[PDB]
Write a protein that binds this ligand. Structure first.
Ligand SMILES: NC(=O)c1ccc[n+]([C@@H]2O[C@H](COP(=O)([O-])OP(=O)(O)OC[C@H]3O[C@@H](n4cnc5c(N)ncnc54)[C@H](O)[C@@H]3O)[C@@H](O)[C@H]2O)c1
Ligand SMILES: NC(=O)c1ccc[n+]([C@@H]2O[C@H](COP(=O)([O-])OP(=O)(O)OC[C@H]3O[C@@H](n4cnc5c(N)ncnc54)[C@H](O)[C@@H]3O)[C@@H](O)[C@H]2O)c1
Ligand SMILES: NC(=O)c1ccc[n+]([C@@H]2O[C@H](COP(=O)([O-])OP(=O)(O)OC[C@H]3O[C@@H](n4cnc5c(N)ncnc54)[C@H](O)[C@@H]3O)[C@@H](O)[C@H]2O)c1
Ligand SMILES: NC(=O)c1ccc[n+]([C@@H]2O[C@H](COP(=O)([O-])OP(=O)(O)OC[C@H]3O[C@@H](n4cnc5c(N)ncnc54)[C@H](O)[C@@H]3O)[C@@H](O)[C@H]2O)c1
Lengths: 334, 334, 336, 334
């Protein structure tokens, strides 16, 4: 099975990819990293993390490498993926975490550069898109470029799946109250064409567009076109929550909904359950993609008109990274 | 007619009440303030405000009074309202902003203590409850204890009223993404029996119960029992947003919902409109109770089914206070 | 073989909860048998399990109507606002870790001895009493001590830096400023907070000057420096992790390398006082197992003629870092 | 008298420059703005400010300009200053606020492009560097490129000047506890070569080099080489404080220090005084470059040895901008 990985974009996601691989003692070896900076800066960022603390393994660097837990990782600095010399250390699967290659057309450049497969850490149009433990059985040996969608997708999908499977989702809308991320702004100023994204992220509630509900059909085909939603980006550094308001195909109670969700999270490494009164910092470092929270379930009904609100936590950094790695490990073995 | 007011609880809401009364050059006369502390400390807090900056008028104090814009205000420190000596300076209407007297039974104390009327800055059970420019016409000459509900109620109600009047609301659910408040905790520690309220407010997304939707029937009786909702408390110091997901009585477009709401905000001092891409800091200092945001309107439709998401902003401190003062001015004259 | 001292914690707050965490983490021979606070087992269990700064508790937590069950061991829970009413004898708690902020003097903490405990270790400055910064002056403890202080997190950060400088070069005079994470003494929203006007102001929205005795009372820890230091704090919006700057006139003209080498030697094989030459920031100190970490990167010598100002800087996790010092002192104090 | 100005870099400082010019009714006209974006996004940014709230004047835009208070201001988007069409509108003095032209040789490009003078809103090496009400008497009719140093310089300088004039400073070191700015990072990631600048600014105390003290000699020639210092960047959006530890030329008391400072601030529009127990949010919107705070003065004396700690607040955005404008007004008339 494929064992050698390259990371393009050693950022919030990319660094945590490495951390998680070492944490679970994967047989996958990161042999090369591509970014835009020096091994020194990358080593500093890897060692020191504002959200997860000190790196649990040794970190050193040379003029062209990192040395992590005694093992050498090549560092390249090629801004165009086609130029990355992936063949030098035999990088087979590229974990694409820059945000700049979010299409099949763009990410195939890695193949041109000598890789064999690409797993994109973000939605990437209508390509094969996987939420582990929702539709990873759609992966096969001919899949060369795959997406794991967004963290919000990885949160929304398992909850939507469980509801759809148990009760039917006829139509629904999502709002995720989401930690700020690097696409936003530190101080008020231009941030491409999105006006809201220009505003100081740690000082505002900021409405934000997300494709998680719009594109749910890639992951749950029967919900294709049945969901919409958006985000409110807020001042927490990581840790996020997704609310879904649904018309279901059945009259339900809160307990019935909660029991169905509990069943779907039983023996499920991707999808956790809680009935404790947690808050967002309690999900930081979660090993799930999504944690359904039974305490926030709400059924609002007048006669036969019924709205169902269901809420799941997610650590948009590490929790999501756990999903990307489970997908990666399976990808490497097809 | 009644012109002399006392404020119980010179807190975030209590101090802004005075600021607003001065700002609009009210004929109402604040003659007394009760709290738990010295004039010195109350004077310091009035003068220097972390959210709204320097107090626009002069402030001084003596051992038992504040002197605000040259006028003397008596200061009392009675922790039981029934002991507050309101007859001394002839306080007739009490603006009750402590959070400790949120029922008719409890606020009866101010009347026993020699006041004539009480206006509670919070929900207070099944009593007359006023959102100005939604149901202020229900205020009556024999009312002696009334509520202005919560800021969230002042945000939700005019949006709900508009939608219901134009389209009918059949059922609906609310989530407010809401600035943290003094009911929460600075560091993790006991905060009565609300476990979530025990958690560090500026470092977490914190689900929180609110009655704004549940008790909406006090303000819009046709909507009794048709709404539920809750809050997510987040790390902004003031400025909040309310989302409502509704099943309406008619099929609609976004443009149609937005035009109805625009008409409802026309010449409406309590309820504003924007189609700008604002964020929470842009609402701080608002003179509305609610500002409907056309940019966030969302219609999700599958077949005969439709969900409608509408969103309004609110300064849960100053905005809400502008509503409290409109209600007080009218209350004072009946 | 092992000294098995029975401990009670008064005030199961930020510090009190981390005291239990840390004792379990190091597999201490101390048994915590009782906790007193102002609330229910249910609420203490919630707070112990979920921590905004340090994440999930590493052991199981449950509660009954009158106890916590932590990793399978029962800890009695009391809620007596007056320490004299705490039934410390019921489970044989002998050494009280006093972490409420309300008994910070010999006369006040006497209440624990009257209620049947034998010794009190106060998690804060407590006036003129034996005041210990571990690995600075813990040799001054003896069998006769019954009530002792570990001073502030700021003292635990200042003292080892000041000791090293004094021993190597002599400090003639100095002033400190700590840029310090906000704590529970401050305010969430603007509102009354005792008599400290500045403490009334929203802690997560302001730089707030704040008085601290860390420098003023340094003589309790390093007698040779009594009266030679002053300082204060600026409280700022980070949830934990703080930094202490000291500006000093030394007894000897120095270079930055010379100051850094001296401080390096002082941190060698020193479980309480760490060193760094990496470009760390406050979140890097969160969860530190040192009372203080000297930062060679911020050393600064300013010199004109024969006049020299030396600025030296140390990080500290004012929560967990300080707690590790508290525990080291607790373990010693319990054996005496 | 020159009165056409162009702003290069319409950022936090650039937009506040225009706000302050309008506020003081300057006879200077901003006729052009260069940035990297559209009029629509600049207009949005001008209108809505996370630190200072809504713009006090009307703001609109066309395809090629802003309309501010009914007056037209051209907008350009030239990355290289030598391409900026300053002559089109006859922009005479360029207020240089991008941070990319902080040297005589770099800001020369504006003069090559047709402007007559340049005021750089930052330290710009060994050039004339003005703190208004400290050394603005050094400006003359022959000057073409000048600096107003940093906000920290505008804070430090007036306090250093009062101390030195009254007592002599023999040596000193500064620490500014300073609001985070746009040179820092929102999430941990590369920010050129400065390792500490890579770290999430709203979640850390971050040491930071600054030359405010190092280069004080350009402003107070007698202190040249007598001061060092640095910054701790912390999570407040604006509003900063500067501490100075000095060895003075005589023995002093705290009362004596504070009276000397009170005196230096009397009828001084650039330099204020306080003995109120203020916090950083209270300095936001200050019309001073610096506000000396008598409550934080501390004298540490051991026989002949004495350390004097003096402290001054500054709004590093708006307050500094008031100083920049004062200097601009004078620069325009020589
Ligand atoms: N942060 C989150 O919550 C989150 C969650 C799920 C998915 N994602 C997705 O993961 C991707 C990365 O997100 P992030 O938060 O880690 O962003 P980030 O900005 O932290 O990291 C991006 C990294 O890529 C580097 N980079 C940029 N352009 C490059 C290029 N052309 N070549 C090589 N390197 C380049 C940057 O230097 C940086 O290290 C994005 O697609 C994002 O949508 C983010
Ligand atoms: N902050 C908001 O967003 C908001 C908005 C709408 C309504 N409200 C409501 O207004 C009320 C006050 O809220 P706040 O945010 O101003 O609270 P706050 O904590 O800022 O103020 C409460 C004030 O009352 C004083 N106080 C407490 N108990 C007292 C007593 N027994 N007698 C006299 N004084 C006492 C306190 O010292 C404080 O000054 C509450 O009912 C709250 O729900 C708050
Ligand atoms: N950075 C820090 O937080 C820090 C560092 C070093 C020392 N300290 C000191 O440790 C002590 C506690 O600090 P903290 O941050 O944990 O405070 P905290 O408020 O989080 O905890 C105090 C705890 O004491 C309980 N309590 C209050 N009064 C009580 C009483 N009369 N009886 C029983 N329980 C009572 C509270 O309910 C709370 O659980 C203080 O003396 C403080 O100065 C704090
Ligand atoms: N923010 C403060 O506290 C502060 C205080 C004093 C001085 N300054 C200085 O003032 C200057 C501006 O700082 P700021 O905080 O406003 O930064 P900012 O990042 O908010 O603004 C920079 C602006 O310049 C634009 N820009 C960048 N490169 C450009 C180019 N090549 N051509 C045209 N426009 C370009 C950006 O789009 C942006 O609008 C800097 O030199 C800074 O050191 C800042």
């Amino acid at each position: 099975s494929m064992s050698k990985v390259g990371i393009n974009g050693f950022g919030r996601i990319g660094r945590l990819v490495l951390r998680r691989l070492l944490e679970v003692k994967s047989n996958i070896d990161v042999v090369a990293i591509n970014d835009l900076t020096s091994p020194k800066i990358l080593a500093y960022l890897l060692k020191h993390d504002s959200n997860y603390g000190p790196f649990p393994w040794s970190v050193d660097f040379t003029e062209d490498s990192l040395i992590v837990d005694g093992k050498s990782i090549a560092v390249y600095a090629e801004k165009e993926a086609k130029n990355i010399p992936w063949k030098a250390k035999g990088a087979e699967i590229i974990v694409e975490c820059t945000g700049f290659y979010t299409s099949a057309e763009k990410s195939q450049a890695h193949l041109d550069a000598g890789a064999k497969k690409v797993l994109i850490s973000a939605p990437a149009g209508e390509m094969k898109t996987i939420v582990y433990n929702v539709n990873d059985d759609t992966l096969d040996g001919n899949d060369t470029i795959v997406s794991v969608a967004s963290a919000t997708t990885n949160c929304l999908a398992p909850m939507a799946k469980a509801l759809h499977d148990s009760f039917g989702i006829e139509v629904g809308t999502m709002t995720t109250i989401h930690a700020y991320t690097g696409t936003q702004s530190l101080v008020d100023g231009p941030r491409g064409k999105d006006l809201r994204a220009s505003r100081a992220a740690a000082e505002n509630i900021i409405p934000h567009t997300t494709g998680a509900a719009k594109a749910i059909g890639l992951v749950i085909p029967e919900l294709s076109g049945k969901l919409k939603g958006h985000a409110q980006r807020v001042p927490v550094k990581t840790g996020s929550v997704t609310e879904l308001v649904s018309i279901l195909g059945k009259k339900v109670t809160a307990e019935e909904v909660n029991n169905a969700l509990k069943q779907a999270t039983t023996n499920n490494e991707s999808f956790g359950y809680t009935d404790e009164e947690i808050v967002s910092s309690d999900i930081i470092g979660s090993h799930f993609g999504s944690v359904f929270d039974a305490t926030q379930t709400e059924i609002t009904a007048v006669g036969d008109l019924q709205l169902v609100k269901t809420v799941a936590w997610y650590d948009n950094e590490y929790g999501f990274v756990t999903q990307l790695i489970r997908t990666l490990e399976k990808f490497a073995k097809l």
